[PDB]
Structure formats: structure tokens, C-alpha cells
């Protein structure tokens, strides 16, 4: 019988839960309505940096992830300062719904 051909995950949406440490969430975000897009014409919010061995890294967040929701509140159409505020106010466990195109 013929060899199995492995599957290929092309893209995903996933929810990562970051446990805030004294230093913060261990990420930078970039983007926002009216701002210079992080990617193409997409004015959304993206994870632009992930601190090595910080909380986000341990939670499985990756640079390039598009940040769709913070604790269930959608960031679609948000300005940069609004996304920063959502994240700073998200409490101890921060559920991050992201879109990941690079596997």
C-alpha cells in the first residue's frame, strides 16, 4: 500500500492565555486604525515582539500573530491606544485570540 502523505496546517485562529507577570505580558503590539500598517494595508493589531522566556512566549504567542480579541472583546477597528488599554486592563489571565498565518 502507498505511503501516507502528511497533512499541512495552512493557518489557524487560536486562543493563548498569558499570565501577567510583574513586568507585563512580555510582548509589544504594533498597528492600529489610522497608523502605518504592520503588514500590507492591514491596520489591525499584531504582536510585533515577544520577550524570550517571558509570559507570552510560555503561553505560545508568536511574532506576527494578529490580535483579534482580548478577553473576548474584539479589536477590529481599534486605534493603537485602545488596544494598549485593553491589554493593560485585562487582569491576571489574558485570553488572546490570534490569527496565525505562518506555521
Amino acid at each position: 500500500n502507498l505511503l501516507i502523505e502528511p497533512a499541512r496546517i495552512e493557518e489557524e485562529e487560536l486562543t493563548l492565555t498569558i499570565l501577567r507577570q510583574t513586568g507585563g505580558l512580555g510582548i509589544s503590539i504594533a498597528g492600529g486604525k489610522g497608523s502605518t500598517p504592520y503588514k500590507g494595508d492591514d491596520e489591525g493589531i499584531f504582536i510585533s515582539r515577544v520577550s524570550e522566556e517571558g509570559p507570552a512566549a510560555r503561553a505560545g504567542v508568536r511574532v506576527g500573530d494578529k490580535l483579534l480579541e482580548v478577553n473576548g472583546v474584539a479589536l477590529q477597528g481599534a486605534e493603537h491606544h485602545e488596544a494598549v488599554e485593553a491589554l493593560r486592563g485585562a487582569g491576571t489571565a489574558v485570553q488572546m485570540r490570534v490569527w496565525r498565518e505562518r506555521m
Binding site: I27, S35, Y38, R49
Partner: peptide, 8 residues
């Protein structure tokens, strides 16, 4: 306009 990036 600016590229906006913030550590959180």
C-alpha cells in the same frame, strides 16, 4: 502617520 509600537 506613524508606525505605532508599544511594550505591554
Amino acid at each position: 502617520k506613524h508606525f505605532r509600537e508599544t511594550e505591554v
